[PDB]
């Protein structure tokens with residue numbers, strides 16, 4: 174029978190209108206964006222409109238947005254810039270970062286690398302076993318005079334848990350007043366919003382952050398992204414990683430990928446127009462899925478890994494485990510004929526055999542983490558599809574148990 | 577009426593077959609290439625075929641090829657790796673780079689930044705005003721114990737002049753034998769092949785290089801790129817700029833842009849299939865352009881800037897000045913009704929004009945250089961279109977000088 178995709182957290186398909194915007198730009202807007210000829214001008218008009226659509230999506234200003242190759246580049250760029258700024262201000266002190274124990278690889282690994290190289294100091298703040306969040310008291314307790322950036326993801330890709338970013342920013346703003354009075358540089362705050370965009374409202378003024386990472390392929394756009402920098406070139410400096418021909422105000426040089434930008438901008442227009450519909454629909458079907466998993470297997474057999482009492486999570490995500498010695502997450506997914514899902518981050522799928530380090534940093538019991546499955550629903554996902562998926566998981570576990 | 581594009585050195589349109597390959601991958605190959613299910617492995621297979629197509633284009637092996645966002649990333653990545661590797665083996669010497677005085681902004685500016693921040697030393701070798709190349713003996717005379725990289729553009733964007741990259745690699749390999757015996761680390765060689773791909777044969781084995789920059793939008797492909805690394809992960813070290821999810825063997829992590837890669841793959845295919853025919857057609861129509869310009873303005877009025885006797889150049893590029901006090905490049909082009917071209921690196925406000933620094937580096941007399949136009953033709957340019965373009969340059973200059 175027909176397949177049901179429930180791995181939207183790993184990647185989303187392109188919206189038809191986004192593909193249409195890309196195809197048009199491929200044919201019509203092929204010229205160099207810098208040129209005084211009509212195909213270059215059309216390209217420049219594409220890029221300008223897309224920058225405005227992205228700013229509208231996050232409630233910022235187009236001057237605060239630069240286009241990048243993706244989420245990984247945007248996240249590396251923030252970190253890099255903070256090091257270079259600190260070096261500019263010195264040239265044996267090192268800059269210090271505060272982040273969480275559960276960040277995407279594109280934050281965790283540049284950070285670990287900086288410590289391995291003795292370039293930076295980093296505090297990885299654990300998440301509470303009670304809330305599933307970094308306690309903001311802990312982030313603030315970790316502050317030292319050499320601290321320059323707090324980077325805390327908006328929502329976790331594996332659990333859907335939403336982090337208290339607005340409160341972190343607010344506490345950092347009150348602290349920065351004491352610091353400036355003491356002659357210490359202000360601390361900046363980044364959020365990796367990769368998983369939140371298109372699923373719940375992301376507003377840079379409600380968030381209060383200085384930087385924000387945008388990831389197209391998480392909200393039905395193409396595999397590029399962007400970076401928001403508050404008061405870019407004015408209140409917040411940004412030291413490029415790349416050097417070249419002057420594109421993106423020299424913050425990110427290289428001839429602009431016009432068709433990808435047309436796509437990102439169109440994807441952002443859709444989130445602006447429809448975010449409220451998307452969120453509500455995802456929520457209904459994810460909550461339905463949870464209800465139908467407990468009806469079919471039993472409350473006693475299901476551990477809802479994404480659920481902490483009173484903690485916001487993404488509306489589409491359900492991380493759960495079914496009790497049984499034979500029902501490791503990868504092993505169950507291999508027996509499914511309908512469900513397409515994951516047992517973690519797409520880029521850690523190789524290591525599907527051992528529990529997710531992320532679930533383990535969330536305090537998920539080792540035996541429950543072995544059996545963990547991440548189901549993430551999308552814009553098209555229906556309750557009918559949820560019924561087929563649960564009936565697929567029902568047959569799968571029976572075959573692993575009859576073996 | 578109809579306009580004629582002669583600015584293909586700045587960018588090219590996409591081939592129809594390329595667009596088709598991209599739009600198909602958008603609909604069909606959208607799953608995460610890291611994911612194990614059905615949709616993932618379809619994307620993976622698009623990426624592997626594309627990397628095979630890239631390999632075949634340059635005469636290499638798919639294991640030696642990583643995908644990047646474009647040529648600027650690829651160029652910066654090579655310079656960055658050499659610095660991080662030097663810092664690795666030191667664990668107050670600095671790494672040293674030899675390059676030319678005529679490189680693209682994505683090579684010159686990252687090196688210039690490195691010398692400004694005191695991270696590296698750089699020798700910008702000038703070009704010979706007899707050959708218009710950076711002679712190999714001048715490159716070898718720049719070598720010092722801290723030298724780790726020579727990077728020399730395969731063909732120049734401005735003039736289309738081809739550099740002697742094979743002889744550079746051959747001599748450096750020979751110098752490297754004596755180095756390793758003296759305990760010194762070997763010198764690696766990079767070429768920015770941006771302007772040569774799809775215009776002439778490019779073969780990693782004939783060029784001898786350790787790195788080579790590939791740029792899709794210069795051969796009717798998308799606005800992404802790739803980097804060849806000889807013996808990647810075995811013989812030649814690459815130290816990444818980016819850190820993340822393990823993609824491109826951890827040399828360039830980040831989820832793979834599969835429709836762009838599918839495009840670049842298709843564009844690489846068309847080059848392998850048709851490089852000879854593209855080259856010959858280009859050379860035909862460019863040569864016709866130059867004979868038409870001379871027939872129409874006179875041999876005395878036209879200064880061909882690209883041209884050094886017995887020096888190879890791209891088949892499609894014609895950089896030339898028309899003699900006259902009013903005829904700065906941008907002034908003539910602004911008067912044209914058909915021709916679309918460029919003035920390359922030249923600038924103009926209203927205080928005055930600045931000729932291309934690149935042409936001045938080739939020794940073009942300042943006054944000639946101020947009048948320089950870069951015309952670069954493409955796969956579809958016809959002799960009939962050249963004729964329209966010469967007619968247009970004629971009416972353009974006529975209105976400027978009476």
Ligand SMILES: *Cc1c(COP(=O)(O)O)cnc(C)c1O
Nearest residue numbers: 243244245277330365367830831
């Ligand atoms: C997908 C994602 C990113 C960006 O990763 P890419 O592989 O470059 O697209 C960053 N952070 C989170 C939390 C993500 O889910």
Ligand SMILES: *Cc1c(COP(=O)(O)O)cnc(C)c1O
Nearest residue numbers: 427428646647648680733768770
């Ligand atoms: C066009 C070009 C590049 C790469 O430039 P991008 O803007 O990144 O596409 C590199 N080298 C040369 C010689 C070029 O012409």
